[PDB]
Amino acid sequence: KIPKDTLIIAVENEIARINPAYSEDHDAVINLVFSGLTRFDENMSLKPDLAKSWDISKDGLVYDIFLRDDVLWHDGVKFSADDVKFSIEAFKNPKNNSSIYVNFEDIKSVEILNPSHVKITLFKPYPAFLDALSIGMLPKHLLENENLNTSSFNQNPIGTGPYKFVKWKKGEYVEFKANEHFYLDKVKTPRLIIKHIFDPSIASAELKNGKIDAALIDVSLLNIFKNDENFGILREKSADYRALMFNLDNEFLKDLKVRQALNYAVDKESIVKNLLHDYAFVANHPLERSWANSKNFKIYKYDPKKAEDLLVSAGFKKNKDGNFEKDGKILEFEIWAMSNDPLRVSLAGILQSEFRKIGVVSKVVAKPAGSFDYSKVDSFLIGWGSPLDPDFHTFRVFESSQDSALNDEGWNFGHYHDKKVDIALQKARNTSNLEERKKYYKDFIDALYENPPFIFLAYLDFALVYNKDLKGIKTRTLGHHGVGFTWNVYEWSK
Numbered sequence: 001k002i003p004k005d006t007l008i009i010a011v012e013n014e015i016a017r018i019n020p021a022y023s024e025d026h027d028a029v030i031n032l033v034f035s036g037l038t039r040f041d042e043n044m045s046l047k048p049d050l051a052k053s054w055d056i057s058k059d060g061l062v063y064d065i066f067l068r069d070d071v072l073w074h075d076g077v078k079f080s081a082d083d084v085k086f087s088i089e090a091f092k093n094p095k096n097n098s099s100i101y102v103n104f105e106d107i108k109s110v111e112i113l114n115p116s117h118v119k120i121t122l123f124k125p126y127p128a129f130l131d132a133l134s135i136g137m138l139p140k141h142l143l144e145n146e147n148l149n150t151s152s153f154n155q156n157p158i159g160t161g162p163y164k165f166v167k168w169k170k171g172e173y174v175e176f177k178a179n180e181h182f183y184l185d186k187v188k189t190p191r192l193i194i195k196h197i198f199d200p201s202i203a204s205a206e207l208k209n210g211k212i213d214a215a216l217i218d219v220s221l222l223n224i225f226k227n228d229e230n231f232g233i234l235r236e237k238s239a240d241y242r243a244l245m246f247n248l249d250n251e252f253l254k255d256l257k258v259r260q261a262l263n264y265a266v267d268k269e270s271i272v273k274n275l276l277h278d279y280a281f282v283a284n285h286p287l288e289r290s291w292a293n294s295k296n297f298k299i300y301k302y303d304p305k306k307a308e309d310l311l312v313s314a315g316f317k318k319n320k321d322g323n324f325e326k327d328g329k330i331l332e333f334e335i336w337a338m339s340n341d342p343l344r345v346s347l348a349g350i351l352q353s354e355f356r357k358i359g360v361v362s363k364v365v366a367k368p369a370g371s372f373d374y375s376k377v378d379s380f381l382i383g384w385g386s387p388l389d390p391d392f393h394t395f396r397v398f399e400s401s402q403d404s405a406l407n408d409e410g411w412n413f414g415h416y417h418d419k420k421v422d423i424a425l426q427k428a429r430n431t432s433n434l435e436e437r438k439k440y441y442k443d444f445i446d447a448l449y450e451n452p453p454f455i456f457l458a459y460l461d462f463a464l465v466y467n468k469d470l471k472g473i474k475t476r477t478l479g480h481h482g483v484g485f486t487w488n489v490y491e492w493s494k
Helices: 079-091 202-207 220-224 254-266 268-275 304-313 344-356 419-428 434-450
Strands: 006-011 038-040 046-048 051-055 061-068 107-114 117-122 164-170 173-178 191-196 214-217 231-246 280-282 323-325 332-338 361-367 379-384 454-466
Touching: 046 051, 061 079, 061 280, 079 117, 202 214, 202 220, 202 454, 214 220, 214 379, 220 454, 231 344, 254 304, 254 454, 268 280, 268 344, 304 323, 332 344, 344 361, 344 379, 419 434
Parallel strands: 006 191, 006 214, 332 361, 332 379
Antiparallel strands: 038 046, 051 061, 061 117, 107 117, 164 173, 173 191, 214 454, 231 379, 231 454, 280 454
């Protein structure tokens, strides 16, 4: 009953501003309206998008970007070097409060040599730069005199992407129309609706009842569509992983042996199998979807006895209640989770149970997001992982100068300080040479094993469930919560 020329896709989240300047991760709506200088194919291979080609100096400081001259903004205005320079400076301007600001801060200058040639010079080498340039470009002719934060542009976007903004019903959906002059390919389905559906049960119901054509469906609900020949299920790998973040300021979690013991205490395989229904994989480190993966790293296997042996080695002894105690101090700490994240709450609970089995006392604290400071709790059920360059969620997450206590923009919330990690990551992000970067990311991975900031738990798979009439859907490695599953929607047809 959904028309053939119409495509209706449910997403969990609704953004406030349809603007790449304010995009968190790979946002579905923004990447429909906008395109960047670069893009990624089904193998997450970096590909030309708005940029035709590029040359990079040997020092890695100068990027000569050659642009397509056949690209139109949705309003018909031609896309040019003027837009690239404007956009980069918009992201770079602190007044814009851009989510993108940090990724562009080692940009020194942007030169417009001709309308199809931009020269970008960097203070220091930035191998992830071509990845960061996958961010959507902004139209200068519409925004040069606007307040980016508040402009009505954010509710009436114009981009170079495969779909044109048509209509926004706030809280419900965004309607799109195919960009008839899309430069990559001809957009197949003329009408696109992105429906906001946060509840997993509701999305599955709407899907089952033919209200939507496609959605990510929680693994728990999959049997609804399994063996239903009216629907296909595409199993999608993601770089999104869950972990217990240790706060190294904690008197117990400070100890290396305690953190190792807690890792050994967790039966991750059972979690993946039972909680996650084998729709996930055991995680050991944060680059298991990256080329940077050493694939030859030590692992903390489930070994309750080893865990206890470690705790004895740190001078803990089980007491009358069966709980490890040292000098009259019980080994006890809080495990915090966002109350609106059912999987993380579940993992917090499971961790607590695992810690009980080996005499470690823990208290689960589940609170709404934004109601507490998770850099100030003993431990935190956290999510990380990018399918993009290995630098993106490593340096900012693990490097010591990114300690959120020392750095406002740091994501090292557990205040982890390891020098082997620091130097490895610093070197890994100082060259573009592939084998060298791998060497340092291996050192990084090895250093993490030696000094665990986390308990890595599981990498997540996501289920794209679609009406069987849908064709042309491709899978690629997804981001946080499966973002990027609509990456080739312009090739989707009925």
